Structure 1
Amino acid sequence: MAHIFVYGTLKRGQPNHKVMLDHSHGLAAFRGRGCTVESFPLVIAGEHNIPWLLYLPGKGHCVTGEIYEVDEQMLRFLDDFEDCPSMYQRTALQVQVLEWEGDGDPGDSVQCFVYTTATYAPEWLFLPYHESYDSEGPHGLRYNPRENR
């Protein structure tokens, strides 16, 4: 019964999207769309091309993305798929609403939940920042979960 913000992994065309396509892994509904008007460090790291959102308000860029309403099971599935608390931690941040679908209208920003890290190595602050995360992009650095898939 919560509102979250997706960077990319269940938006453009990422491997992870399939999770929210079976209600038995939890509820998702397109509850409008948004960006982090709060500038964060979206950096690409790890040998499997695992970008991270370090919890640093006002450092970096505004990640464009989408706002899903979720049930407690979707919020819990991501609480086990993402290897949190080890890898990530679930946190609260500020998200500009680019569209709001339905009642319960917070104004032009909302407080969503996101997975972040506070436990990072300093090398990841020397990394470049980005405004979305899309396998389609010309970078040539895309996620490798089953590759062959």
Structure 2
Amino acid sequence: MALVFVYGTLKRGQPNHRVLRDGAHGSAAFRARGRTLEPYPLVIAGEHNIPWLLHLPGSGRLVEGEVYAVDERMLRFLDDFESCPALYQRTVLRVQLLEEEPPAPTAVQCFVYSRATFPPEWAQLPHHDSYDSEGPHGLRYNPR
């Protein structure tokens, strides 16, 4: 299967998690708790307080998230859920698995939804290692 690393509103406990569990969309199975190997800026921006993984690897913070195994139906759904390619783009990155001889692999390549073109000042907004709509910043996700 394809693997998707989710860092935002699709995570367990977050406002859009349900779309992964709606079987009309295909299938998504939790595989691992993960953390990016490379840092990225993850910022809450815009009137809706959406989380954006800015495509600036090498800056920001290591980002916490969840790895899901998805079928082709669910990948096509999620591409459209994320308004690709105009808003987000589906890119790849390597994720560290968070859990003897030979030792277990500790990395896996995943797809992720990142954003390449954005207001430049967004890069100076607070950087998040773990997004939560209900987190300490107070900027609750606002789709309305």
TM-score of the alignment, normalized to the shorter chain, above 0.5: yes
Conservation of the 8 A alpha-carbon contact between 2:97 and 2:108: yes
Q: What secondary structure does 2:128 align onto?
A: coil
| Counterpart position of 1:82 | 82
The answer as to 2:92 corresponding to 1:92 is yes
How many angstroms apart in 2 are the aligned matches of 1:114 and 1:85? 12
Q: Following TM superposition, where does structure 1 have runs of at least 4 consecutive aligned residues deviating by more than 4 angstroms?
A: none
**Counterpart among 119, 122, 132 of residue 120 in structure 2:** 122
Structure-to-structure mapping, 1:93-112, within 5 angstroms: 93-99=93-99, 107-112=105-110
Where does structure 2 lack aligned partners over 5 or more consecutive residues? none
**Structure 1 CA distance for aligned equivalents of residues 134 and 119 of structure 2:** 28
Identity %: 72
Tell me the residue number matched to 1:15: 15
2-structure distance, mates of 1:85, 1:54: 14
The amino acid that maps onto 1:109 is A
C-alpha separation in 2, matches of 1:39 and 1:98? 16
> Structure 1 length normalisation: TM-score?
0.87
- Which amino acid counterpart does residue 136 of structure 2 have in structure 1? P
| In structure 2, C-alpha distance between the alignment counterparts of 1:21 and 1:120, rounded to whole Å | 30
CA RMSD of superposed structures (Å): 1.7
SS in 1 for 2:78: helix
TM-score by length of 2: 0.90
Q: Which residue of 1 aligns with 2:137?
A: 139
Verify the 8 A CA contact 1:12 1:134 in the aligned structure 2.
no
Q: 1:18 Cα shift? A: 1.1
Shift of 1:37: 2.3
The question of whether the paired residues in 2 share the 8 Å contact of 1:49 and 1:144 is answered with: yes
- Superposition deviation, residue 89 in structure 1: 0.5
